[PDB]
Amino acid sequence: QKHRVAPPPHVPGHLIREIDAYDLDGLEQGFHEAWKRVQQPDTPPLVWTPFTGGHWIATRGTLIDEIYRSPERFSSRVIWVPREAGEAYDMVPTKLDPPEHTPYRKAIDKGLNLAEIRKLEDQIRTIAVEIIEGFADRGHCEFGSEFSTVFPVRVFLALAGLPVEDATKLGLLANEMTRPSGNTPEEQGRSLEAANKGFFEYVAPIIAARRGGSGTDLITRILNVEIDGKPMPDDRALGLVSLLLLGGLNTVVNFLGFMMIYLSRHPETVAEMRREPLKLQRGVEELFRRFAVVSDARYVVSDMEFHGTMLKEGDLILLPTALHGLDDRHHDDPMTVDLSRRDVTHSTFAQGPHRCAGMHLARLEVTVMLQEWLARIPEFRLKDRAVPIYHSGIVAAVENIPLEWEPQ
């Protein structure tokens, strides 16, 4: 049974669309495909759904880009749907607007800037090689459970100086953040609250131990960046370290599954990467354009008209990032990966002040993964008749990716 809310007075009937972000119509065919069903040639730039507590959805790339770039009009004070979950959410600095956001972002950038990420290339490569060597000779693997859920997790836990045995409990918390359980807004709110608390409980002793610490790990490094001349307060630190884990341990995992399903079905595209290593390197950003996974929100700061649509203060707008990179008004033949595509503009990492702090790390993980994968398993396919299973929410997920190849 689907929970519906009645539309508020300012939402006209002709803009209503029954879209469930947590269980999209057509999701069994794929997450991207399911969002693309929403983006029809004449569909309005903003539509309103009665599901998930009632909210807007931006349906075109130009709006998505603009909203992310405009924090004075579209605040991060709520970035999740339903509102109850968004109000429970306590991660830093994603809940902050400038100027409060800026010193926390500066602190994160001390650890995640491109020059720092470059130093990690060899470590990341070693991890990828070790995992791939476990199955390359075998001729098959279930890519989700044996690679995509393993590689980024080992990379990030190593970088954060945390034990690998914590991966399972952290993954469970992350799943309830990005796809909270429940069939009511209030239930999903409670699920998010519990997961967010679980994170805080995990990180609290780590913060206490690493304040003023001598560790070289990512957490010590970022934690000990001063905020306005003083140590970061406890409340902010909890949200900050939690966010690092949430993003670092999960988002790339999901991206890799979608990417690899496509590649498994497009041997010609894989062959291009194998034959031209620079095409692989220069083509990674096209993969980010094509396999967006985040759909999050902003809070309308003031009553306004935006793209011909009346919005009220407090309205939530969901931003399905896939609808920028895959917008046929921005990219011709948007569902094909064209490694030589010159314009790859997308909002896979969002835009504006919150534009993904981990984006250099994401790009490097994917680049290293492809290089080491193709070196050891040059050709591969999805098992005949296999059906991946898809999940939609604030971050998309996919499982059951059985690959097969002739060992080289």
Ligand code: HEM
């Ligand atoms: C495929 C990989 C990734 C994707 C698609 C992605 C996507 C995003 C998006 C869309 C945002 C903006 C959220 C918003 O403000 O509404 C974001 C922010 C962020 N991401 Fe990522 N991310 C990825 C990887 C990573 C990694 C590996 C990390 C490592 C910790 C990370 C850390 C962060 C942080 C700290 C923010 C908040 C930045 C701020 O608020 O200033 N991300 N990410």
Ligand SMILES: CC1(C)[C@@H]2CC[C@@]1(C)C(=O)C2
């Ligand atoms: C939606 C996000 C991708 C963004 C960074 C990590 C994430 C899960 C958040 O909680 C904010």
Ligand SMILES: [C-]#N
């Ligand atoms: C970002 N996750």
